[PDB]
């Protein structure tokens, strides 16, 4: 409703770096808000794409950002009559970023990994890796839970069970308020998908550089399955956390699996031991239900509510015709221990191929009326097809069915404006929470400041 669309703030990275693919707010030890922006195709040392992370200080005029430097050198360790190898070329560092306390987690989902033992090998595969930085101190650490040292023949002899070679850990990420990092790995267990969790503090204290294969004892991974419904489901394409079982001492995990059960798509709510509590099945095949998930309480009863994006949903129109527009589903958590029910609201896109629902960002309370609100992206929507961000206001019964405000893309065609969203933080310290929108196709981030309601 009250985001200012006139005086925007633009930050920009290098050309072709895909600056703005991911972003998040970051507060330092003194509570000063910055923006952390991932750029997954920034050039490395050998003039090859490796990705990179930028830490932008808040300035109303915007501009360029300093780099949050990570090591981009390939690594080799000859130990235990084996050879460990990490390949950071086209690893995509900055394809997801997330902030917790004064720590930044940047992940490279396509970092490759191989183990050589004479004439055998593990196979060079994208296990993924994440990089952790404490900018104020300079501390650095890595976390790569899917790295193994098992040779390729063993997997064949055991029918490819527990095969974490193509995890792509860091594809999606989130951090519980207690400080547990949860990584989505859609390719784990031969493209079923897995989750990996470990406390940030234990990632830092158990990491030493050059070890390449180290244990993190407090870490916890999900489990393989023989159920065909999970095959090629990409369990972990999107991840989120929330409170869904009534017990406040437990944190629950929300996991998107947009090709679950032969591209039906699904979202599951689990406990921290990855035991399943509820499962939201998709509505239409290939709609990519579960592409994006969001957790926030919209109706103000203190019970977290769930949102799920299906950006390829095809709306039925006259003359038996279908129109890919994208759809968002709202599920309101009921009172006490009961399953989540049918959707309380359906939001369907307007523009053909607009991909409404590609990103869903909680805004906090934007108009300060007592109900939390959200922003939904349609990165190829709008009457010009340049991109649109739609704001929906919370209310006692759920969400309003019509948007209160629409942000049209200030960038040219192909910018993918809205592909990444993040709200619910007040960056200019005016009492109202603000919204940052990424446009990786234009290598830019736009900051929308909320202002008092007119």
């Amino acid at each position, epitope marked *: 409703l009250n985001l200012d669309p006139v005086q925007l703030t633009f930050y920009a990275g290098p050309n072709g770096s895909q600056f703005g693919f991911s972003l998040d707010f970051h507060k330092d030890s003194h509570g000063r808000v910055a923006i952390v922006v991932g750029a997954p195709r920034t050039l490395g040392p050998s003039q090859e794409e490796t990705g990179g992370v930028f830490l932008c200080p808040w300035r109303a005029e915007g501009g360029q950002c300093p780099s949050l430097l990570f090591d981009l050198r390939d690594e080799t360790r000859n*130990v*235990g*009559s084996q050879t460990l190898q990490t390949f950071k070329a086209r690893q995509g560092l900055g394809a997801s970023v997330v902030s917790w306390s004064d720590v930044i987690v940047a992940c490279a989902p396509w970092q490759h990994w191989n183990v050589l033992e004479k004439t055998e090998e593990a196979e060079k595969t994208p296990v993924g890796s994440c990089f952790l930085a404490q900018p104020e101190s300079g501390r650095r650490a890595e976390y790569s839970p899917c790295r193994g040292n098992t040779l390729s023949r063993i997997y064949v002899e055991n029918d490819f069970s527990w095969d974490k070679r193509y995890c792509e850990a860091g594809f999606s990420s989130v951090v519980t308020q207690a400080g547990e990092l949860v990584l989505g790995a859609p390719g784990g267990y031969y493209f079923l998908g897995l989750l990996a969790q470990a406390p940030v503090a234990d990632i830092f*204290s*158990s990491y*030493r550089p*050059g070890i390449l294969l180290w244990h993190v*004892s407090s870490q916890s991974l999900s489990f393989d399955s023989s159920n065909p419904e999970y095959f090629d489901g990409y369990w972990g394409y999107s991840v989120a956390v929330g409170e869904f079982d009534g017990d406040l001492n437990t944190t629950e995990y929300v996991v998107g699996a947009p090709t679950w059960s032969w591209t039906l798509g699904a979202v599951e709510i689990l406990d921290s031991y990855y035991q399943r509590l509820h499962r939201l099945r998709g509505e239409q095949m290939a709609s990519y239900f579960g592409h994006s998930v969001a957790v926030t309480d919209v109706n103000g009863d203190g019970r977290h509510d769930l949102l799920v994006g299906a950006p390829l949903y095809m709306e039925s129109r006259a003359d038996r015709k279908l129109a890919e527009v994208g759809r968002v589903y709202l599920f309101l958590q009921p009172r006490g221990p009961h399953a989540l029910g049918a959707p309380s609201l359906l939001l369907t896109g307007t523009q053909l191929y607009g991909r409404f629902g590609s990103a869903i960002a909680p805004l906090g309370d934007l108009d300060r009326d007592g109900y939390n609100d959200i922003a939904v992206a349609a990165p190829y929507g709008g009457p010009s097809g340049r991109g649109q961000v739609l704001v929906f206001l919370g209310q006692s019964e759920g969400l309003r069915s019509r948007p209160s405000q629409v942000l049209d893309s200030p960038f040219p065609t192909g910018s993918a404006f809205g592909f990444s969203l993040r709200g619910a933080v007040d960056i200019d310290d005016n009492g109202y929470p603000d919204l940052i929108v990424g446009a990786y196709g234009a290598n830019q981030v736009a900051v929308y400041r909320a202002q008092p309601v007119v």
Partner: antibody
Amino acid sequence: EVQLQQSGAELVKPGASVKLSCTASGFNIKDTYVHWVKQRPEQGLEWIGRIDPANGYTKYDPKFQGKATITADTSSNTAYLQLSSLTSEDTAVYYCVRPLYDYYAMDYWGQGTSVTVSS
Amino acid sequence: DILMTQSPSSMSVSLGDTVSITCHASQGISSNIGWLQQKPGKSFMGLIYYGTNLVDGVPSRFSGSGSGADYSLTISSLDSEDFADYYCVQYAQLPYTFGGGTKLEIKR
């Protein structure tokens, strides 16, 4: 806390067999490799072999192929070292080891099991 | 197999001294070396892993250094508890091999 609680000292005859145990305390035996090391006063420390209790695959120093047989039962969270056709020279103290962080290191040691071979 | 030549066999030193044990391998092992401690009539304790890294709980007076095929454990200011046996172990290759051993004995 991590602790490795081994079996009590064994007293056995030459030609017989003995199966030492190494029980994990405060953690899952499935987490890391588990190694076995043999200590003698003159000869010193010798590496017997290792097992990954997550799958059961083992490695051995060729010197010990035949005598030593390393096994692991995830259930009771215990690893085993089985010695066969015992001899005077098998009289030694046997430790089980696991690494702290590094996959390939030797950082946490059990108290040691004393084996004596004699008629 | 890789040969771990550990010197000296023993040394008689006093409290507060700064001493240094060395270890030399038959080939390069690129810091893949560990340092152990065996207090008299007791089991083993890990001191170092991967050349220089301290095992959790070990006092900072211990320190590992070295490279290629020559490494050095060092104790700054000996404590009464530090008088024990010390071994190096390589894990650059299977089979793992140990050093001969080094006893720290009280000087008088």
